[PDB]
Amino acid sequence: KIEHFISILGKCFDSPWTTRALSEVS
Amino acid sequence: PAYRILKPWWDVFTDYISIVMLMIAVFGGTLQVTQDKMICLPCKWVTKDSCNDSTGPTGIKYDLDRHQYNYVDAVCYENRLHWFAKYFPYLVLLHTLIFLACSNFWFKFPRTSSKLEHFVSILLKCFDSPWTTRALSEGVLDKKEGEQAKALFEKVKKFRTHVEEGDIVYRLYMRQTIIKVIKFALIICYTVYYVHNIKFDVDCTVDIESLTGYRTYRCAHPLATLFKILASFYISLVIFYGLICMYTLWWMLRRSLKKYSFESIREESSYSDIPDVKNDFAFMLHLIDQYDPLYSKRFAVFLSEVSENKLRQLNLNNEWTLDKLRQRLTKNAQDKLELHLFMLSGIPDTVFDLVELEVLKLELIPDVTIPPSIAQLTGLKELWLYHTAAKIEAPALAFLRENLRALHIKFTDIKEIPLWIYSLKTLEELHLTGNLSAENNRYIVIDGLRELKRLKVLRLKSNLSKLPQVVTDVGVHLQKLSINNEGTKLIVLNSLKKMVNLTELELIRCDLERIPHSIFSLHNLQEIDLKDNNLKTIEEIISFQHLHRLTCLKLWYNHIAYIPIQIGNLTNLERLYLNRNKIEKIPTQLFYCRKLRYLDLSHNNLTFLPADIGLLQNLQNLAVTANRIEALPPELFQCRKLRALHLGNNVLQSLPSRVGELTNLTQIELRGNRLECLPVELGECPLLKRSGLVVEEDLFSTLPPEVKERLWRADKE
Amino acid sequence: PAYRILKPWWDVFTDYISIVMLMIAVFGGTLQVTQDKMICLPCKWVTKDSCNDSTGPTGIKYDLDRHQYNYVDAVCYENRLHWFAKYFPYLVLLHTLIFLACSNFWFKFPRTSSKLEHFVSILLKCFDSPWTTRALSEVLDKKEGEQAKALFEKVKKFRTHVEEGDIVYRLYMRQTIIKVIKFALIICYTVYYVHNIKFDVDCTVDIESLTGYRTYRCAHPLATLFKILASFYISLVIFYGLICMYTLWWMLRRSLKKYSFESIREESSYSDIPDVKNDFAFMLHLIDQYDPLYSKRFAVFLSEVSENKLRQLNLNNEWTLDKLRQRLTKNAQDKLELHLFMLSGIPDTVFDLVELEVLKLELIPDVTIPPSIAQLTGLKELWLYHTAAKIEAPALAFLRENLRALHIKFTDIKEIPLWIYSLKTLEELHLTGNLSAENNRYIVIDGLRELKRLKVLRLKSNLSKLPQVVTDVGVHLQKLSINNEGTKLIVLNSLKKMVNLTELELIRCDLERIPHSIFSLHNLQEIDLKDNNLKTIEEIISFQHLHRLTCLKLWYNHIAYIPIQIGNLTNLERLYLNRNKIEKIPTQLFYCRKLRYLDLSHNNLTFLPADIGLLQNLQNLAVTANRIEALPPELFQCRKLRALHLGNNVLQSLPSRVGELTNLTQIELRGNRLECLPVELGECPLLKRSGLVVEEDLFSTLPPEVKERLWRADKE
């Protein structure tokens, strides 16, 4: 579970759509 | 590893000084475990708890065993040797360990370590990136390298947002510096104070007379001079460490490391848009400047929106390949090759590499510049500008001046229209859709269409309250004036008299509520459209015999409830589009005009069709769709040129068999009627097919299966 | 790792000597820590605190305990043994550490470590670059050329970065100076104090109250060993001195802040390599000391001649001869064209191909044509657009015997070539670009007087006024076309001198009046006034004086009616009057029956008039887009018509005699109102389906035998 969490969180951290949704929010 | 860039010369100096100090600590420690002792000799004569110090010489006989001597050594070493001499190497080791922990606390503390590793990684990988050299040199770029460049730009932006919020790294470095300097002060104070207590000769008085026989002994500490020079060397090293620490503190406090000005890099390069980075980001960039200004110089190119704009344009040139543009090519209503560019960052250069393209469609393109590579676009004739603020290169401006012939401009703001459209000379078709009427910009912006000379089609969907004086100046050569106000009445004021060369006039959705006299003053018109002008009465058409050339009177989408008989004077009409009106009866005088070819009276209030329709032999497409016509007269089939009988949505009870005499019929619409059954003679039309014969399936089933086979074969063959 | 290039022989020697000195330092330190002791025996007979040195023998009974002996040893080792004999290995260790710190402060100081690492990376990248081999040879892949250009730019940026200041040279000089003075002090004090390491020591410490004896004689067992560890060490320092001294001489015999590439720029062809200076010069001198080949093959990245060679080689690999034949096209003159657009440089393979006839150079900057343009055989056209052409004297002389036609596209004076005036053997020339600038009214075209064989000059330069220089130049002119694109042309009767003109084109001159100078030239066969916005042609009465005009061109105008007098021009053979405002064309106008070509499309003709029957020596009539309903006997008295431009009309029918017109190249029917094609059109198998343009629904009404014959003749 720790490896799955860190893999998901790291791949989310380099996801462009995270920045896209942050721009949409703010 | 890669943290060396974040360690300036002071940090390296303290790192090496701490290493040498730890070597001193280890050496002193192993000597203290190994050969630290005190050779003690008793004083034979004592006087008030002190040694008296009062024929050949002979040695003094103490009568002590070797083990009594060892006991005396251990007791006096424990009791009367100063604590500094005993615990100097361990104190030095503790001090050096604390110094190393202070120098390496920010590397291990997760809150600062995450920021530090992010900074080091993205800064190093920006430093070895090739697009940094490409931008600082100011082509073609590899796909993988382009993906790396865009990912690095996004990572730099997200890290800049992530780091600038707080100043945890600056505060931690500050606190480490004050802790190190105050510990240096304490170390130097106590070590200098207690360094003189390391003595070779120690007088001990330990009260072990019951076990040995003597009370006071004079011991020699052998590792006292060696420990003294080791302590002096340690004091000198701590002095150097402390001086470096106060230099670091002065460097931190003299300037403001929380504020970086990029004025050196931004003025050197063409990028004047690099922001003044602040806070923690500014702090580690100052640290990198203490290492090497080149890293900051090559990193600053990733903080400017000009650089990312150029990168986006180059990447868009790269991704939009030629073959995908070939499969993107389409055709318009004018049978010209077409390419719709919708919602792109810029315009691809591979679009401009095309040669077969005729109409390029620029829709929602924010602030792009037209490259001169338009010299390749020789077949380009129609530039379609939708909400696109376009800047123009001079050779491309000349090329469009000598090639481009049709420009459509839609804009939301009157500043969005390019100012180089007036310099165009080969332009004939202009479509200015969007409000030209604004305060002090009401037709003053388009006052430069006087520079336009060959303009013949001027579409204006622009909510014009009154028609411009500039089109009164231009309309000597204008041949079509399509004005859409979407609900604003024109005060024409008979100003079209100077506009004599019009062949078509399309006043659509103008809410005129009456036909003005400017159309009547003109003479060259052949296609008159008055769509959605709310024309309640059209009684003026008696004067339309003055217009000897009119051939298409598109009086549709209006409030026309009747037709005056003077339309019989209009023998020159070929297409009379009266559909979607309120006309309830056709006068027979309208049926005098033998030249009518497209009699579209659909969506109206007609209840009957006069028989005189048989006189209209040139009629081809009679569309009476959605009317109240119950029975078609046989004389309707007298006209043998009916090509498309749109009888749909009517109340036709039965279609007579005389339709079998018609030959030009290609598509007849009967679905939605009261038609009981389809007669057999409907199959007698040769050119009619299933696509042409649109009808309900059960109505199709009424035809004979041999006639149905003929029609199904016309669908097949 | 990769720093071994920056360590010359002296640095390696000093590093090895420092390692050996550290070895003997730790050896002496281990000895001094572990078995350094002093065996002190009391002198039983003494004289004034000095050792007097005065039946089997018996041992001297000193009556001393073992611990009294240990105390005597400790006191006379601390008090009387010399400090050098006790702390020699620690001094050697400290000196060796100082020497190592001085040697490695070059690599450990960040300010110079960054520059050293950058220089190492750049030098190794240039060392492993394949293009250097080609640079030392006198084909490369796309990746090879791209990385060569990128590393060229990196070398230029590094040269800008490092040459500005000398921090590496200053630190190296300071390190050498410090090492030299440290060697001097070390040799001085070690030689002075090496004579105190003695085996025998007379100690007198005054511990008589604790031992009973005043003076003792002590043996220091390690002393002799320390002697062979001291003098040896001295010898090492001497070497470490002399080598360092040599290094100092190497930093003073010449200015290391001025590297000269004279040997390389003399041996190699590149003579443009600059004399680099400062830190760049110092590290290049160090690399020369290591290996001259690194500097030799790095010197080719400091010259712009090698940069130009790489650029031309890269563009040569881009555009091979096969891709040139791929890009080969043909123009309107049926000549071989090669559209070269947006290239950083001109190729050489494009001049290798002798087939080329029209060398096209559109918007190609930094153009410098080598004499390999002499390789071109059919070169008679040079379509240079927005091109600044530089041509050497042999290639210019080659142009002086083969070049014939030359088109220039320019933005005022910026893109106008200067070598065109010396060209005296060309025959055609074109110009395009605004010339009527402020204070420069037609002053830039004053150098076209040496051109004597020029015959064709065409201009499109939006002239507000007629240039007097043009009138002076045009003496030897045959064809001249003037395009003003919506600007007034003030001829002002100045064309009377232009007697040699045989074709005068005035496209979009917006004249609205025919200038009176046209009526003076008896050589003009073609008069072109297209898009002049002519409404009333009342100047054709004055055209009666001319007897040379064979074709008037008043098309794309608004001529409401053509007057009667124009029917007096028998020499007219081609009437281009299409897209005009002509309502009824008079029959008297068709008294001239030798109207071979005719353009009357897009007009307002309501019927084809009578004296078309008079016409006999024609080949086409353009009746597209007017109000004519039928092919009358008037068009049917013509027996030489070949193309009918009758499309998008209200033409009701084709009567029978058009089915006798077997020599019918084309018909145009793009929207005409024909009932059906008559069976008389089946009388002519000469007209094929590709030959005529007929609507698909109109074409299918022909009989199946006729349609099969039409498709057959399309195949046949």
Ligand SMILES: CCCCCCCC/C=C/CCCCCCCC(=O)OC[C@H](COP(=O)(O)OCCN)OC(=O)CCCCCCC/C=C/CCCCCCCC
């Ligand atoms: C605070 C952290 C410190 C870390 C400590 C590391 C481990 C310490 C434990 C040591 C493990 C085993 C070693 C014990 C050996 C004890 C033998 C002993 O005490 O015997 C007494 C007797 C007394 O010696 P004297 O000849 O009087 O010497 C007086 C000097 N003029 O000693 C002996 O007989 C032999 C001593 C054995 C020495 C062992 C240690 C030597 C260490 C080598 C030092 C390395 C020097 C490095 C460079 C020096 C500078 C150039």
